[PDB]
Amino acid sequence: RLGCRVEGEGPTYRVTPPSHRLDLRLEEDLVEEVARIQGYETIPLALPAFFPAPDNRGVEAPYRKEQRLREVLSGLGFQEVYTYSFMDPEDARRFRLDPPRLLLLNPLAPEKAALRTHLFPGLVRVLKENLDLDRPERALLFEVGRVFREREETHLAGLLFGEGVGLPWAKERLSGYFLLKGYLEALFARLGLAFRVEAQAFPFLHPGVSGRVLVEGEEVGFLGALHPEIAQELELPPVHLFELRLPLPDKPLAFQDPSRHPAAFRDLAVVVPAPTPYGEVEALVREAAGPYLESLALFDLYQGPPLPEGHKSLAFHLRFRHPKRTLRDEEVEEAVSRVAEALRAR
Amino acid sequence: RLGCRVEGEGPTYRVTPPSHRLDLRLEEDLVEEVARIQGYETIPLALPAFFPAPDNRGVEAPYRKEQRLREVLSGLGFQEVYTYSFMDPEDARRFRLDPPRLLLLNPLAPEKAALRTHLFPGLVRVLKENLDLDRPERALLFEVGRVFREREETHLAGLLFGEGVGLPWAKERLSGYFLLKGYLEALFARLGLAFRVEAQAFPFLHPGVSGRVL
Amino acid sequence: VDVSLPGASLFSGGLHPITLMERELVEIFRALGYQAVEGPEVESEFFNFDALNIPEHHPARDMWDTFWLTGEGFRLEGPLGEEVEGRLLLRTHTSPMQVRYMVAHTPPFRIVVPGRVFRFEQTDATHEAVFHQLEGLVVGEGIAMAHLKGAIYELAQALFGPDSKVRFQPVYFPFVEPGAQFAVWWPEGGKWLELGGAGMVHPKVFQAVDAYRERLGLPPAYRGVTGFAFGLGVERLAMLRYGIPDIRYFFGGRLKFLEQFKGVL
Amino acid sequence: VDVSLPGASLFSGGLHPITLMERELVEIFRALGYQAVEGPEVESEFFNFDALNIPEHHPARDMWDTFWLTGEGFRLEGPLGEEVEGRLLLRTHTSPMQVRYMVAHTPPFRIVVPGRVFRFEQTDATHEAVFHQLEGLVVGEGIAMAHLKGAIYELAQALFGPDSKVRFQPVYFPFVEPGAQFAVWWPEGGKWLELGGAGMVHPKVFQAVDAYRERLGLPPAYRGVTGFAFGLGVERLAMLRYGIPDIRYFFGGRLKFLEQFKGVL
Ligand SMILES: N[C@@H](Cc1ccccc1)C(=O)O
Ligand SMILES: N[C@@H](Cc1ccccc1)C(=O)O
Ligand SMILES: [Mg+2]
Ligand SMILES: [Mg+2]
């Protein structure tokens, strides 16, 4: 009826289409025909059942991983945000960063002619426009997106700003950089990943308040206070940032029986130059504590009148334990020196 | 071969089992037989496909709801905990609360002879024993469980204790009741639910620091 | 400023391993179209025993050490919110849910039922009185054992494998014929793990369901349909999976333990 | 103490509506055994057009307003980590992933691909240049259209219904024959919603895949297998679902907006 010639006896036929029909070349094109003429509604409903080829097994992991993370954040207290993957070539300047490696040939507008190499610029920018529309006292958010440098990459950045948290009515607040870090650390605490920060010079980050980020023993992303020069180049006050690369590495848990025998407690302080970083300090103390160091915390420190003008004090709470048996004091005040010795012996 | 008598021409047969076989009454019992004798391993592998009866549609909601919540908490900062559904009748006193409506007839021990009417007692109790084993400075956790009063009920309780949060080294902390509330409010902020508290007298709660939840 | 310094002591929460394991198992069956639903920890001797072909004075009832309860003014709800009768007890397994669900619904369907169960037993390193199980039920015309077999097989793969496999041996249960116990191949640790029991839903169970339904005014729905159900111990698997050595550890609210599973996901 | 007082100002996070919608859609297909996987936003003209039966100088290429890119030292990765060539651009839809996945895997399978796409267009109340789509692909011997039909039907039910239904009309796509557009019945608002397109994977697409595979050393895997794929606009649905009026709203980082979906789940 569609003007085709059908030769053959079956089961496979010779069908020559009318010349005015150019969309008819394959057998499938021919099937689509019977279908539309019979009516797509005359096709029944069904569901397939099969055991999927093995190489398809794990597949979801990556995606899944990204989402659990996405979720934890929101549960931790971050508002998620969605930003255009575009970038104003000009901002490569405005924000002290290298130029975009990818440019559009048909940009939507000269201010979205490149491809974001960084996420945070967009965040900060959002901050601004929010302030101008509605005046939020504080703000804490994040965004996960693809940035483009030599290779496409999945990045995660977060921004904090405002008075901080604390009692609304009551005077004080607690905010600033150490707040952002506070959250950051808790996040990894939740992901079961070891994270720490080490001062690092960043063109876009105020120095002194600059620092690279070390997830479980690795260097990825940074964290810090937004360099004021930029803070002001924009009608903006002080802001705090951090931008990482995903996927986050992962430490497969190795469960470990905790012992019942009570721990060995200790009071201890360290006096070292005002410049020295907490890091190395904890590092050393820790690396010398011995194989029975259960805990290691810092409950206090201050510059301090009663000591060397260029040195500081360190409140370190210590705990020890032995799986199989209780720890004999012989080994405690002993290993304690093992540290103190190489402590400032260095 | 199993000693059955088989009469009939098919397709349905008359099978009388030997008297020593008492487990053979139904046709199905008879099938289990061919199966074990042919070997369970000789049964192929397959997967069913069908559109489920409509009344089964929403079903997962409740469970799902409970879990999202469970998850948010952990993400907010609460350690989850699992406590026995048992209760020491004695604690009905120790903790100022009414007596358990359900008791065991074969308790595991007189200290687990009743059914928890409240969750928190168990939490607090856990707190203690933790302090005695390891000495945690602060603690924030929760637990979701079934309590038993006139009807079985799903309850959620959380406990806070310790110095509170703030700078470890730096002097101050911020904790106490208004901390717990702080978290509570944020949780609802996350669930999109309006919550508030109003002072209420509770036998087990210090007054002045007591309050019902809305 | 010293950036290496510690930030504001913020609380990092975690989840209980059972919850994690439960979750994991659930996500698995969910991918095969199973829907999760829970039942009551306090049940009626009717749903726990009678409904499933379990006799009063015969050897079967004697496979589950039950906790009997007492007390008044306690209202137990039936599948349709009605009040039901029978000696009260603590669900000895999650199977009762099998019934409540069927009474309340129409085939075909696929459900899975996580839940804490209770058995009167002396608590040791590998035995508890309080633990969790995960019941599974799939009813519909045409269901056969091969389906159950595939079901379990998919589960194996999902857990270990594709270098893992399944073992099905015949076993006896009053609510299924054929009945079977199934083990799973663990490629890593190299051993066979007895996971749980399963089988083709027993005719007298279906009978029971319909009978109670009509007594409730509903039309029969399980005549001419087939089905299989299974149930497995969660703690065991969780222990093998997350590598825990003492089952008592789960109900032992120790933090040093619980935190160990903070980032499990 | 005054308990009615406000507690410590703690930060309450939230999620972006697209993420929520995405999530919801994903959980849906996951229950039918679909697995989620993502592709790259920056693609090669080869995967975006050529692989799928899309010609250079013919009317088809002319249905997608593409963003062309430029720049050096940028490394684009192929399905097997190899470096691939072709004019660079911004994925115009998520279909390219269809290919990358097939080249890299073996049937039978079910996947779903969420992802942000880009189209050169003027941004108005119902049209964006940057938005998201969700691609779906199911390949295997025996696959037919009825499967696609059921697939979509299940999706409908999952979203509205069981008082909702599906509409399938024939439409033209270079990578599927038969091709079709499908609408869904919204019982509440009472109208038909055009959701997305779908169809039976085109033979030349399968051809392409195998051809590139062999060029990569792999044996052909898509001869003698069938398949269907579909793709739908996420923003549209999210708007209808969560009741949003302006599509521009999504990329407009306004908080008063974003927070509105805090407790969506
Ligand atoms: N819950 C059952 C396990 C099982 C379930 C279903 C069928 C067979 C066995 C038990 O207590 O052992
Ligand atoms: N992503 C396609 C939608 C589609 C997918 C698969 C088959 C048919 C249509 C589009 O751009 O329109
Ligand atoms: Mg045609
Ligand atoms: Mg038998």
- Of A278, A241, A255, which Cα lies nearest the Cα of A192? A255
- In the annotated binding site of D for Mg(2+), the residues are 177
Nearest CA-CA distance, residue C220 and chain B, Å: 14
Ligand 2, atom 3, residue with closest C-alpha: D231
Looking up tokens 């301090």, which residue turns up?
Answer: A304
Q: How far apart are CA A50 and CA A65, in angstroms?
A: 26
Q: Encoding tokens for residue B141? A: 């956790």
| Pocket of ligand 2 from Cβ distances under 6 Å | D 93-95, 133, 135, 173, 176, 196-199, 229-231
Q: Which ligand is nearest to the CA of D131?
A: 2
- Among D10, D147, D242, the strongest candidate for a mutation testing the B interface, having the largest count of B CBs within 10 A, is D10
Joined tokens for residue C180: 């079977």
The continuous run of DSSP H or E covering B197 comes out as: strand B197-198
| CA nearest to C10 within chain D | D10
Whether residue D136 contacts residue D112, with contact meaning beta carbons closer than 8 Å, is answered with: yes
Ligand 4 ion: residues within 5 Å (CB): B 23, 29, 32
- Per the CB < 8 A criterion, the answer to whether D202 and D102 are in contact is no
Q: Which residues does a 6 A CB cutoff place in the pocket of ligand 1?
A: C 93-95, 133, 135, 173, 176, 196-199, 229-231
Strand A103-104 vs strand D69-70: parallel, antiparallel, or unpaired? antiparallel
CB atoms within 10 A of CB A250: 13
Question: What's the rounded Cα separation, in Å, for the pair A150 and D74?
Answer: 4
Q: What is the DSSP letter of B142?
A: E
3-state DSSP of chain D? CCCCCCCCCCCCCECCHHHHHHHHHHHHHHCCCCEECCCCCEEEHHHHHHCCCCCCCCCCHHHCCCCEEECCCCCCECCCCCECCCCEEECCCCCHHHHHHHHHCCCCEEEEEEEEEECCCCCECCECCEEEEEEEEEEECCCCHHHHHHHHHHHHHHHCCCCCCEEEEECCECCEEEEEEEEEEECCCCEEEEEEEEEEECHHHHHHHHHHHHHCCCCCCCCCCEEEEEEEEHHHHHHHHHCCCCHHHHHCCCHHHHHHHCCCC
Å between D172 CA and nearest CA of chain B: 29
A230: three-class secondary structure by DSSP? helix
Fold classification of D1-265 is BirA Bifunctional Protein; domain 2 (3.30.930)
- C132 among known catalytic residues: no
* Cross-strand pairs, C133: C115, C233
SS3 assignment, position A134: coil
Who among C170, C202, C258 is closest to B81 (CB)? C258
Search chain B and give the residue with CA nearest A301: B169
For chain B, report the end-to-end CA distance as a whole number of angstroms: 72
Q: CA quadruple A304, A309, A312, A313: dihedral positive or negative?
A: negative
Chain B, 127 to 186: residues with Cβ < 8 Å from chain A are 133-135, 165-171, 174, 178, 182, 186
Q: Looking at residue C218, what DSSP letter applies? A: P
Cβ atoms D61, D55 nearer than 8 A: yes
Bridge partners for A218 per DSSP: A215
CB within 8 Å of D225: residues ≥ 6 apart: D107, D108, D139, D140, D141, D143, D206
Q: How far is B200 from chain C (nearest CA, A)?
A: 27
Q: What is the DSSP letter of B42?
A: G
Which of D116, D21, C6, B191 has the alpha carbon at shortest distance from A74?
A: B191
This PDB structure is determined at a resolution in Å of 2.7
Torsion of Cα atoms, C163 then C167 then C173 then C177, to 10°: 100
Q: Which two tokens stand for residue A318?
A: 């210590």
Amino acid (1-letter code) at residue C256: K
Instruction: Tell me how far the alpha carbon of residue C93 lies from the centroid of ligand 4, in angstroms.
Output: 22
- Quote the distance between the C-alpha of residue A334 and its chain's center: 42
Q: Is A29 annotated as a binding residue?
A: yes
Angle among Cα C72, C77, C78 to the nearest 5 degrees reads: 130
Quote the CA–CA distance of C250 and C241 in Å, as a whole number.
Answer: 14
Ligand located closest to C177 CA: 4
| Interface contact B26, partner A, CB < 8 A | no
DSSP secondary structure letter of residue C98: H
Q: Is A46 on the interface with B (CB under 8 A)?
A: yes
Distance CA A88, CA A71 (A): 30
Query: How many Cβ contacts (< 8 angstroms) between chains A and D?
Result: 206
Cβ contact D39:D97 at 8 Å: yes
Pairing mode, strands A14-16 and A5-7: antiparallel
**Residue among B110, B133, B119, B109 at smallest CA distance from B84:** B119
Alpha-carbon span A244 to C109, nearest angstrom: 45
Burial of A343 (0-12, 13-18, 19+ CB in 10 A): middle
What separation in Å is there between the alpha carbon of D197 and the centre of ligand 2? 5
> Is there a catalytic annotation at residue D176?
yes
Crossing angle between the packed helical segments C234-242 and C17-30, to the nearest 10 degrees: 100
Q: Is A5 exposed, middle or buried (0-12, 13-18, 19+ CB in 10 A)?
A: exposed
The secondary structure element, H or E, covering residue C97 is helix C96-104
- Mention every residue, 6+ apart, whose C-beta is less than 8 A from residue B155: B118, B119, B144, B145, B146, B147
Q: Which atom of ligand 2 is nearest to the CA of D64?
A: 11
Distance in angstroms (rounded) separating the CA atoms of residues B164 and B159: 12
**Among all chains, which residue has been given the structure tokens 């111990």?**
C233
Residue A91, sorted as left (phi over 0), alpha (psi -120 to 50) or beta, turns out to be alpha
Closest CB from B179, B198, B209 relative to D1: B209
> Rounded distance, CA B189 to CA A191, Å?
23
DSSP conformation class of B143 = E
Beta carbons within 10 angstroms of residue D203's beta carbon: 15
Task: Please give the Cα distance from C149 to C147 (Å, whole number).
Answer: 5
Task: Give chain A positions within 8 Å (CB) of C157.
Answer: 57
Residues 6+ apart with CB under 8 A from B193: D263
Residues from chain D contacting residue B178 (CB–CB below 8 Å): 5, 7-8
Q: For residue D161, what are its two tokens?
A: 């219904």
Sheet order of strands, B114-115 included:
B86-87, B114-115, B103-104, C69-70
Identify the sign of the CA torsion D169, D175, D178, D184: negative
Q: Which one, of C242, C47, C33, C236, lies nearest residue C128 by Cα? A: C236
What per-residue string of b and e applies to A9-44 under the rule 16 or more CB within 10 Å gives b? eeeeeeeebeeeeeebeeebbbebbebeeeebeebe
Q: Give the best residue of A21, A31, A40, A187 to mutate against chain D (max D CB count within 10 A).
A: A40
Question: Which of A80, A112, A156 has its CA nearest to residue D250?
Answer: A80
**Residue A155 carries which side chain, given as an amino acid letter?**
H
Q: Residue A243: how many CA atoms within 13 Å on its side-chain side? A: 21
Helix, strand or coil, per DSSP, at residue A145: strand
**Quick check: is D225 catalytic?**
no
Breaks (C-N over 2.5 A) in chain B follow: none
The helix/strand/coil state of A307 is coil
- In angstroms, the CA D14 to CA A71 distance is 9
| Cα of D135 from ligand 2 centre, angstroms | 7
**Quick check: is D64 catalytic?**
yes
Phi-psi map region of D65: left, alpha, beta (phi>0 left; psi -120 to 50 alpha): beta
Q: How many CA atoms lie within 13 A of D11 on its CB side?
A: 34
Annotation says C229 is catalytic? yes
Residue A141 burial (C-beta neighbours within 10 Å; 0-12, 13-18, 19+): buried
Q: Cβ of D189 under 8 Å from any chain B Cβ? A: no
**Residues C93, C100, C202, C241: which is the catalytic one?**
C93
Q: Taking a C-beta distance cutoff of 8 angstroms, is the pair A278, A315 a contact? A: no
Q: How many Å apart are CA A2 and CA C177, to the nearest integer?
A: 58
Please say whether the beta carbons of B193 and B167 come within 8 A: no
D166 is catalytic: no
Beta pairing partners, D191: D186
Q: C7 near A214, Cβ under 8 Å?
A: no
A22 CA to middle of ligand 3, Å? Answer: 9
Q: Is A284 exposed, middle or buried (0-12, 13-18, 19+ CB in 10 A)?
A: middle
Closest-CA residue to C68 (of C138, C14, C119, C143): C119
User: Would you call B155 exposed, middle or buried from its count of C-beta atoms within 10 A (0-12, 13-18, 19+)?
Assistant: middle
Q: Would you state the torsion angle of the CA atoms of residues C172, C174, C176, C178, taken in this order, to the nearest 10 degrees?
A: 40
Planar angle of CA D195, D197, D199, nearest 5 degrees: 140
Q: Distance, CA D199 to ligand 2 centroid (Å)?
A: 9
Q: Residues 6 or more apart from A293 whose CB is under 8 A from it? A: A286, A318, A319, A320
Which domains does chain A show, CATH number per domain? 1-45 (3.30.56.10), 60-250 (3.30.930.10), 261-346 (3.30.70.380)
CA–CA separation, D49 and D64 (whole Å): 10
Report the SS3 class of residue A108: coil
CA B63 to chain centre: 11
Q: Map residue A272 onto helix, strand or coil.
A: strand
Residues D11, A165: C-beta atoms closer than 8 Å = yes
Catalytic residue among C138, C229, C234, C238: C229
- Separation in Å, CA of B124 to nearest CA in chain C: 11
Q: Are B140 and B79 in contact (CB under 8 A)?
A: yes
Cβ contact A301:A313 at 8 Å: yes
- The upper half-sphere exposure of residue C11, i.e. CA atoms within 13 Å in the direction of its Cβ, equals 34
Q: How far is the CA of C199 from the centre of ligand 1 (A)?
A: 9
Residue A192 and residue A253: Cα distance in Å, rounded? 8
Q: Give the CA angle between residues D177, D178, D182 to the nearest 5°.
A: 125
Judge residue A81's burial from the number of C-beta atoms within 10 Å of its C-beta, 0-12 exposed, 13-18 middle, 19 or more buried. buried
Q: Which amino acid is at A58?
A: G
Q: Does residue C78 sit in helix, strand or coil?
A: coil
Name the experimental technique.
X-ray
Distances (CA, A) of D58 to A32, A270, D55, D178, D179: 22, 76, 6, 20, 18
